[PDB]
Paper text:
Small Hsps (sHsps) form large oligomeric assemblies with a high capacity for holding onto nonnative proteins that are handed over to the ATP-driven chaperone machines for refolding. sHsps are ubiquitous among the kingdoms of life and within mammalian genomes occur in large families with members differentially expressed in many tissues including muscle, brain and the eye lens. Small Hsp sequences have in common an “α-crystallin domain” ([name]) of around 90 amino acids, with most having a short conserved C-terminal extension bearing an I-X-I motif and a longer variable N-terminal extension. The [name] is an immunoglobulin-like beta sandwich comprising strands β2–β9, and the assembly unit is a dimer. The conserved arginine in human sHsps is on the β6 + 7 strand at the dimer interface, not far from the dyad axis.
Here we have solved the X-ray structure of the [name] dimer of human αB [name] close to physiological pH, as well as higher-resolution αB [name] wild-type controls. Two mutations improved the diffraction resolution of crystals of human αB [name]: L137M substitution and truncation of the β2-strand. The highest-resolution structure was solved from a β2-strand truncated construct, αB [name] L137SeM (residues 71–157). The RMSD between the high-resolution 71–157 αB [name] (2 Å resolution) and the [name] [name] (2.5 Å resolution) is equal to 1.589 Å2. The sHsp wild-type [name] X-ray structures all have a deep groove that runs down the AP dimer interface. The groove is maintained through sequence changes, register shifts and across a wide pH range. The base of the groove is lined with four arginines, Arg120 and Arg116 on each of the β6 + 7 strands.
Numbering used by the authors:
A (entry chain A), B (entry chain A): 73 to 150
Amino acid sequence: DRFSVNLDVKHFSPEELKVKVLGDVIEVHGKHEERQDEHGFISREFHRKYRIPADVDPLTITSSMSSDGVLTVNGPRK
Amino acid sequence: DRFSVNLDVKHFSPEELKVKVLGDVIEVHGKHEERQDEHGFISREFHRKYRIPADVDPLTITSSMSSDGVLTVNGPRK
């Protein structure tokens, strides 16, 4: 029992991600500079927005990141 | 129902922390270079070791970090 959304961000280090709560919107921004991988070189950037449900206080929204590279944003329901 | 230890690492960015599982030991290493804060300048380093309980498979150990600056290391019991 709680609001929760998950996002696969394994291509981004925690420092390349920012989570912000603006009004009743959760904003997740990810950006990394050109980086070498198995296939060549790559840079990535995304901006994701979630609507916070009415029964969830935006002030109580927190987040966590797993060693899996999964970002979780969650909050208690009121 | 699950093995879990928490560690307050709010003074360290995720990239300044490393979690390693060696045998049945969880190793958490934190280190940050000299950094300005409210009181002056500070560098910190710690090395913490936890014993993994017998009924916990070390291979299934994962971790996560909260926006609170709390590091959690956890694993299912077998």
